[PDB]
Amino acid sequence: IVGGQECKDGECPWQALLINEENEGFCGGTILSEFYILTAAHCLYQAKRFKVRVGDRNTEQEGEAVHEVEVVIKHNRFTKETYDFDIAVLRLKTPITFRMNVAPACLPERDWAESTLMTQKTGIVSGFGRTHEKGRQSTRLKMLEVPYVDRNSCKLSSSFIITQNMFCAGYDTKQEDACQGDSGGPHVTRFKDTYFVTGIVSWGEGCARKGKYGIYTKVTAFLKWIDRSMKT
Amino acid sequence: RKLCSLDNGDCDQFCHEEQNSVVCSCARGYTLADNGKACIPTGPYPCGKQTL
Ligand SMILES: C/C(=C\S(=O)(=O)N[C@H]1CCN([C@@H](C)C(=O)N2CCOCC2)C1=O)c1ccc(Cl)s1
Numbered sequence: 684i685v686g687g688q689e690c691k692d693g694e695c696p697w698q699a700l701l702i703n704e705e706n707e708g709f710c711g712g713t714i715l716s717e718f719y720i721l722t723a724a725h726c727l728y729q730a731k732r733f734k735v736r737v738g739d740r741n742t743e744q745e746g747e748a749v750h751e752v753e754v755v756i757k758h759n760r761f762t763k764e765t766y767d768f769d770i771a772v773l774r775l776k777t778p779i780t781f782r783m784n785v786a787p788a789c790l791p792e793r794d795w796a797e798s799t800l801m802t803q804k805t806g807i808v809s810g811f812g813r814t815h816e817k818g819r820q821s822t823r824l825k826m827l828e829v830p831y832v833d834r835n836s837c838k839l840s841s842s843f844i845i846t847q848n849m850f851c852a853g854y855d856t857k858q859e860d861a862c863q864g865d866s867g868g869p870h871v872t873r874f875k876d877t878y879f880v881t882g883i884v885s886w887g888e889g890c891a892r893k894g895k896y897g898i899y900t901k902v903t904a905f906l907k908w909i910d911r912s913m914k915t
Numbered sequence: 916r917k918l919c920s921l922d923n924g925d926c927d928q929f930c931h932e933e934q935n936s937v938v939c940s941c942a943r944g945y946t947l948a949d950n951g952k953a954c955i956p957t958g959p960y961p962c963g964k965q966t967l
Contacts, residue, residue, distance in 0.1 A: 692967070693965050693966035693967040694965055694967070696965065696966045716962075781959065781960030782960070782966070783966045784966060785960075785966070786960045786961075786962070786964065786966050787960075787962040787963075788962060788963055789928075789942040789943075789962035789963035790942065790943075790962075791929070791942070792929050792940075794931075795929045795930060795931070798919075799923060799930070871963075874923075874928070875923075875927055875928070876964070877927075877928065877942075877954075877962075877963040877964065878963040878964075878965070879942075879963060
């Protein structure tokens with residue numbers, strides 16, 4: 684996350700961090716329930732073997748719990764060429780114990796999310812990714828309020844295709860955005876003090892570049908797919 | 916603005932229009948309150964709540 688603020692105690696409890704063999708974070712995820720994590724399908728190529736860490740806000744200090752993955756459920760239509768269908772669900776081997784800094788984000792109903800959540804002014808993106816386009820992964824969990832961007836405006840700004848499975852959020856020139864290592868992490872939208880999962884950090888042309896926005900997987904497009912992935 | 920487009924039909928969470936009236940509902944781990952509008956957490960650590 685470029686810009687934004689540090690997540691304070693209890694503020695981003697649905698954040699998950701995918702960590703490699705070296706125990707280094709390389710992508711985020713969103714806690715959906717005691718057994719399930721939501722992430723980006725493209726993250727599944729950035730490590731051969733990985734585990735999921737929850738409850739950690741500071742990677743330099745041990746509420747945290749490390750969970751091994753039992754089943755990886757990647758969307759069969761994910762394409763490396765456009766990042767279309769950038770979504771995966773992880774079933775963990777052991778259930779997550781909810782506590783301070785560890786709790787699931789709510790999954791909304793589709794129509795209502797489209798009419799009520801996606802129409803809000805802003806959502807919140809979070810992660811342990813880079814804090815500058817060129818830089819080291821953050822050791823602290825960060826979050827950032829990101830305005831929803833007009834669908835036409837973001838297609839116009841984009842050098843790459845923006846499908847119906849994607850949406851744009853962020854700022855035209857202000858220097859704040861998700862960045863490398865934030866992929867797979869949560870985009871949530873608050874409604875009456877309840878936070879709903881609305882996107883998955885997916886891609887961007889660099890980080891926080893003038894006239895470019897962050898691109899996120901549109902969770903409303905996959906609610907049935909997610910529901911189905913959690914039942915089997 | 917009428918029904919669900921009027922302040923979410925006074926619903927805490929989901930709002931749907933069935934026939935010509937508001938029907939509220941909640942996410943998993945919540946129960947609809949007696950008033951048919953509020954959502955009550957069924958236990959600790961309901962989804963979507965900061966743990967402050
Ligand atoms: C991860 C990232 C910024 S990055 O600079 O780390 N990686 C960039 C490099 C090029 N791309 C895109 C253009 C890309 O290579 N794609 C997208 C289209 O399909 C093919 C692959 C990135 O995602 C993000 C910025 C904003 C969000 Cl949201 S996440």
